[PDB]
Design a protein around this ligand. Structure first.
Ligand SMILES: [Cl-]
Lengths: 76, 83, 71
């Protein structure tokens, strides 16, 4: 049922990560969102019915460059 | 290379409250430089971007990770404390 | 580093989306998670978060909100 998606966000300046967190969190079906990773530049989101390709497109349009890094199932 | 994961610092992770706690830590290296790390389930699978390519990575009961990684790259696993 | 838990009245179209966006946009936030079987409590973790400011915004924009924990 639930998906885990991880996105790397470019640190281009002016609170990119905060803005990306906000945009990801606003997506329908989200249960949780966290800033993670060795460089604190990855957003990990868990939820249902999230389209990862659309989420990347929206980040690139509204916040800055972003890359999809992981898609996995969370229903162990 | 055998990389000594016993001396790697833990990932910066978040145990999302609505899904089970994952049992493993993973570490991704490019030519022996740690690129990142995180958590994953044991006895499971994930799709991860490893350098230029998506890789289907499988984990065993002991957090050993298998995949067909691009040249110079590897993703290695270990059990989290207590698991 | 703080964990703040807020219960929000989220009983209509897009409530959780709006609430999550507002919380996740706050300065210093590391994570935001819906908890409880009804996913009606928001757990936010981070640094330098003003719970009064956050609650005020939720009450104005989403609905009734109650502070449950600050640790
Ligand atoms: Cl209150």
């Amino acid at each position: 049922l639930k998906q885990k998606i991880v996105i790397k966000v470019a640190m281009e300046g002016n609170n990119c990560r905060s803005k990306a967190m906000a945009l990801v969190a606003s997506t329908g079906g989200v249960d949780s969102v966290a800033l993670v990773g060795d460089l604190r530049d990855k957003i990990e989101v868990v939820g249902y019915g999230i389209d990862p390709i659309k989420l990347i497109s929206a980040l690139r349009k509204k916040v800055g460059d972003a890359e999809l890094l992981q898609v996995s199932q969370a229903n162990k | 290379r055998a990389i000594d994961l016993s001396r790697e610092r833990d990932p910066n992770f978040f145990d999302h409250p609505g899904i089970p706690v994952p049992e493993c830590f993973w570490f991704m290296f490019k030519n022996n430089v740690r690129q990142d790390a995180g958590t994953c389930y044991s006895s499971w699978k994930m799709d991860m971007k490893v350098g230029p390519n998506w890789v289907h990575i499988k984990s065993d009961d002991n957090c050993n990770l298998s995949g067909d990684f691009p040249p110079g790259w590897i993703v290695l696993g270990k059990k989290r404390p207590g698991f």
